[PDB]
Design a binder for this molecule. Structure first.
Ligand SMILES: O[C@@H]1[C@@H](O)[C@H](O[C@@H]2CO[C@@H](O[C@@H]3CO[C@@H](O)[C@H](O)[C@H]3O)[C@H](O)[C@H]2O)OC[C@H]1O
Length: 328
């Protein structure tokens, strides 16, 4: 029963908007870039806060999607994680350390740790995966882009000296990069990145917000699923997809057009409130929470994403993003 690996015909239903910025003195414009896990009935979400003044991050939890908007926000600048530019989190449990990791950007590829996801006050001040700064290959190829959207995924090889931990990132210039280190060394020792995919003619076809997941029980050419956000010809965001037999393998398109996306306006049905034409920077809500980023596709995917009123006219950082949910 790999029932929910839908090949080239993915189909979704979206909720209305589920999470809004608070009406508090921070005057946040958008809630963005979610990462989420479900643990014994509680959803744990980390997201970016966005306004023209800057970016930081929030943590919140809830048990019912209809009540998510009422969840109190823990502003992570109150933890050692702290004030400053931080955005676009990914959360997973790194089992060999018995620590949760929060991977995100701060100008570099960064991470924080915490032994208990339920205690957001303990997230550490950032440490970076690239101690000397922006890698040469990224500085050489970024142009007028931005180094964004960091993603870790580890293979499940039992031997920690053979098992690899991969770190992907984008440049808003048409490149997708990948570094690696062994499980034994992680988070230390990330290699110089390599460009693994590029779209030089249309940079917007391979834009940002990459996700790489393991498909549980899949052992061949569709073992790994790559999602990347693209911008369509009328400015609407959607996700392209590819598959491979390994994380550092060759990626072959799966559902990779605007007309037939992994998720986009074309294949998402709003059965209730219809509030966005963009399906942007999202993540699958994971129940298998460890560093292998494994999805069980015997069950429907829930993908928490950011959407926005298509009629909004603001500067990009002031756009009124809200979180919503698509379900198979
Ligand atoms: O503060 C910086 C952020 O603004 C930045 O976010 C990216 C800004 O550019 C976005 O891409 C644009 C989308 O709309 C099109 O019309 C433009 O041509 C694009 O450039 C991108 O999606 C955002 O991630 O990230 C880095 C921050 O320092």
């Amino acid at each position: 029963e790999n029932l929910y690996f839908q090949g080239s015909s993915w189909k979704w239903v979206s909720t209305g908007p589920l999470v809004f910025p608070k009406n508090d003195e921070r005057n946040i414009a958008g809630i963005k870039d979610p990462t989420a896990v479900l643990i014994n009935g509680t959803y744990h979400v980390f997201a970016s806060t966005a306004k023209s003044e800057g970016y930081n991050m929030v943590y919140f939890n809830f048990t019912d999607f209809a009540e998510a908007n009422n969840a109190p926000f823990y502003y992570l600048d109150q933890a050692p994680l702290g004030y400053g530019y931080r955005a676009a989190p990914q959360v997973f449990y790194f089992e060999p350390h018995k620590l949760w990791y929060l991977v995100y950007q701060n100008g570099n590829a960064a991470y924080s740790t915490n032994p208990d996801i339920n205690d957001p006050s303990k997230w550490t001040a950032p440490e970076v995966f690239y101690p000397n700064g922006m890698p040469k290959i990224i500085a050489d190829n970024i142009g007028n882009g931005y180094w964004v959207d960091m993603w870790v995924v580890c293979d499940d090889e039992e031997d920690p000296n053979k098992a690899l931990c991969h770190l992907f990132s984008s440049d808003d210039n048409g490149h997708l990069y990948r570094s690696q280190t062994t499980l034994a060394q992680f988070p230390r020792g990330m290699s110089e990145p390599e460009i693994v995919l590029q779209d030089t003619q249309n940079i917007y076809a391979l834009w940002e917000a990459a996700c790489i997941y393991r498909i549980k029980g899949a052992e061949g050419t569709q073992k790994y699923l790559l999602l990347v956000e693209a911008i369509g010809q009328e400015g609407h965001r959607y996700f392209r997809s590819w598959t491979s037999d390994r994380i550092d393998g060759q990626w072959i398109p799966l559902a990779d057009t605007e007309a037939n996306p992994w998720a986009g306006e074309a294949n998402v049905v709003f059965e209730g409130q219809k509030w966005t034409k963009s399906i942007s920077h999202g993540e699958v809500i994971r129940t298998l929470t460890d560093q292998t980023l494994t999805l069980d596709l015997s069950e429907p995917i829930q993908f928490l994403y950011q959407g926005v009123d298509p009629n909004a006219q603001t500067e990009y950082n002031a756009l009124p993003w809200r979180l919503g949910l698509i379900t198979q």
